[PDB]
Design a protein around this ligand. Structure first.
Ligand SMILES: [Cl-]
Length: 188
């Protein structure tokens, strides 16, 4: 059956305005670190990447559905640019950290963590932050991206006028990736 990489997140339903903004942010960042790559899809993590035995994928998804189904949609703000790495410092990310709405993400995490525990999986990061990743690169490029680049990225974001794109984002769904499979579920 195998063990399958499993991750729970909140998709971000990117539309043209956001993608066009990223068309400016990413080349800006690439003047500092050319090898940055745009994310293909956008989401905010609610869990670590864990592994689940194949037999438990559908039960895990159904456990999530049962919990997530009662959780209402909500609004968040993600307009604070951040540079971060993975734990091993072998990948660097540019993302947008959630400010308003963080508390609602924490409530989602509390439910996901319960499902994780129900299946013996690791619960969420001990220092929770939520962020919408925009781009990544191999290696540790924090020093190149933090400082002037970050400030300039933030100023691009701060100059962006349509509040619905980053300032008042209305969540819609939670999704669970397991291997190559993606299981969606609505928020109320
Ligand atoms: Cl590079």
């Amino acid at each position: 059956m195998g063990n399958w990489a499993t991750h729970v997140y909140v998709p971000y339903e990117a539309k043209e305005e956001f993608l066009d903004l990223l068309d400016v942010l990413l080349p800006h960042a690439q003047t500092y670190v050319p090898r940055l790559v745009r994310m293909k899809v956008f989401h905010l993590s609610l869990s670590q990447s864990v592994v689940l035995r194949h037999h438990w994928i559908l039960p895990f998804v159904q456990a999530l559905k049962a919990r997530m189904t009662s959780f209402h949609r909500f609004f968040f703000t993600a307009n604070q640019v951040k540079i971060y790495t993975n734990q091993e410092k072998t990948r660097t990310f540019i993302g947008l950290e959630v400010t308003s709405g963080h508390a609602q993400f924490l409530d989602l995490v509390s439910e996901v963590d319960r499902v994780m525990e129900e299946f013996n999986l690791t619960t969420f990061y001990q220092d929770p932050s939520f962020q919408l990743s925009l781009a990544w690169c191999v290696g540790d490029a924090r020093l190149q991206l933090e400082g002037q680049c970050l400030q300039e990225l933030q100023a691009i974001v701060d100059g962006f006028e349509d509040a619905e794109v980053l300032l008042r984002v209305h969540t819609e769904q939670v999704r669970c990736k397991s291997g190559n499979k993606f299981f969606s579920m609505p928020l109320k």
